[PDB]
Design an enzyme around this catalytic site. Structure first.
Site, PDB file in Angstrom:
ATOM      1  N   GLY A 144       0.841  -1.181   0.000  1.00  0.00           N
ATOM      2  CA  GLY A 144       0.000   0.000   0.000  1.00  0.00           C
ATOM      3  C   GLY A 144       0.877   1.232   0.000  1.00  0.00           C
ATOM      4  O   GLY A 144       0.573   2.246  -0.608  1.00  0.00           O
ATOM      5  N   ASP A 145       1.994   1.137   0.692  1.00  0.00           N
ATOM      6  CA  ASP A 145       2.904   2.250   0.745  1.00  0.00           C
ATOM      7  C   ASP A 145       3.511   2.487  -0.643  1.00  0.00           C
ATOM      8  O   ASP A 145       3.938   3.600  -0.955  1.00  0.00           O
ATOM      9  CB  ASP A 145       3.975   1.966   1.798  1.00  0.00           C
ATOM     10  CG  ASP A 145       3.375   1.753   3.197  1.00  0.00           C
ATOM     11  OD1 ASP A 145       4.067   1.188   4.074  1.00  0.00           O
ATOM     12  OD2 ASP A 145       2.211   2.159   3.426  1.00  0.00           O
TER      13      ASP A 145
END
Lengths: 306, 306
Positions: free
Chosen positions: B248-249
């Site tokens: 997600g980062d």
């Protein structure tokens, strides 16, 4: 004087989480980290009992720097050999259950092992060499037998607290003192031992085989000590054990601290068992005051044997 | 130019273990240690994509020193604020049941949580502020709402990646970008979601409140993007996901890297979704070359929404 060897030190990351469950994001409520390893722990406890020691072994990376800094702050003699990999981080999860997960051992080039053996040639008559803990698989399991020989050829007193092949191997070297718990002892002789009676015949064969003294713990069932001078039993003070991350190491420190103080091998047993219990009952490790106290209590339950 | 904020940074300790039982011991077969924290990861993945950033947050203890040394080597911009606490250690156990164990957040004094807000005052029009990761309970779950403001009132682009009250409270602040996965969105619109249409009405209302762009991933099924210029879907590359630590980062870093290079909000999506699954289809953080390739793959998969 007293040298401790820790072949695979570590940072013990103690964490209590009454909710620790598999496949899930566990949070921690109480976090603590302290330098670890059996040799190191005997050092630390010795210090708390008012005795100096010089800690030996291998340390690497930022985690090793943490271990070194700590002992430094505790003003404990030390002379670790720097290695390439990082010192392992061991995880101790308390709470409901008690689960442990040890980190991988860091690579140790052959030169370092040679250097560690080099340092041992420094033992003088009357010094004590403590070899406690596991022997990394990458190293010859006969390593303790070797270190014990170097020590014995210099008049140094050797105390050992290991298991597996390493402990089997040390016997021919005839160390001065061994402290196997009853399970480790059963594993050594390949026979089950559950009571004091189960162990006596074996202990007697070990003493005759050159081992000068032996102390076998039977957990909450007391401890048995044999010397070619005699054999006797002793009980544990009993109480709620608030911790169990270095109680066997405490027994070793107690025994050695007492010997430093001039007491006799037999006379030392009471103090060592108490030191183990004291640590077993406090959140942290035993204090000189606690031990003396409990020791007075145990110094009667002394029942002959053999 | 691109600022990242990590309130609760850490050292991520990954340990592969098989048959990871309970109650007894567990010997790691493989270990790994690296700087952790969502904001931190975004800075690291941005570096790999060819873009600098200045990471902000709170570090402490020898653990904090480690984090700092590591990012300084990867030459990642930085300026954390030293807090008397000890940066946490999150044990990420992997195997057939990847579990987690997050450490107790350190301790941060008011003046710290104040010199930080004080750092944001330097932000300038065109700059970017990234806010991701949970908030330490030691701080108000409204802290992101507070920072978005300072940031927004400065022509800065604020992107947020959180969840819970934290995510809920930031909305009234009107951040420029949020990426709730289809679940977090249910945990936000306090209503279950499922269809690709079961979210448009709600992503629509959010855009109407002032939020510039929303990227909502349907775990395994694709992702929906919405901005004032309309919305569209895009499917995930599809492949063997080996790692999840920081996917997600990566979508966030990808989206920001793509806007830095001039591309438009909607045209940057393919690139971001590509960075996400390129990191996932790997045993580490995605490489530029990897993204660009899958980027094209997803490029074709584009469908406007009704």
């Amino acid at each position: 004087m007293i040298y401790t060897v820790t072949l695979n030190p570590s940072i013990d990351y103690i964490v209590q989480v009454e909710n620790f469950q598999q496949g899930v994001v566990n949070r921690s409520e109480r976090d603590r980290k302290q330098p670890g390893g059996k040799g190191i722990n005997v050092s630390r406890v010795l210090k708390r009992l008012g005795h100096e020691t010089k800690a030996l072994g291998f340390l690497g990376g930022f985690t090793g720097a943490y271990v070194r800094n700590a002992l430094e702050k505790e003003e404990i003699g030390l002379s670790f050999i720097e290695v390439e990999g990082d010192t392992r981080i061991n995880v101790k999860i308390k709470g409901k259950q008690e689960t442990e997960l040890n980190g991988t051992a860091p690579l140790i080039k052959k030169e370092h092992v040679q250097a560690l053996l080099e340092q041992l040639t420094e033992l003088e008559k009357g010094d004590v060499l403590v070899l406690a803990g596991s022997v990394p698989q990458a190293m010859p399991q006969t390593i303790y037998r070797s270190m014990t020989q170097i020590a014995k050829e210099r008049g140094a007193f050797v105390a050992v607290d290991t298991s597996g092949e390493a402990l089997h191997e040390v016997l021919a070297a005839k160390p001065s003192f061994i402290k196997p718990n009853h399970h480790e002892l059963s594993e050594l002789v390949s026979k089950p031992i559950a009571s004091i009676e189960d162990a006596i015949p074996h202990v007697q064969r070990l003493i005759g085989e050159g081992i000068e003294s032996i102390l076998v713990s039977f957990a909450g069932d007391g401890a048995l000590f044999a010397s070619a001078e005699g054999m006797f039993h002793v009980n544990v003070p009993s109480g709620e054990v608030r911790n169990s991350v270095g109680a066997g190491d405490s027994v070793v420190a107690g025994f050695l601290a007492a010997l430093q103080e001039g007491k006799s091998l037999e006379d030392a047993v009471p103090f060592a068992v108490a030191a183990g219990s004291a640590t077993a009952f406090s959140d942290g490790f035993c204090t000189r005051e606690e031990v003396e106290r409990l020791q007075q209590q145990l110094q009667r339950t002394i029942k002959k044997e053999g």
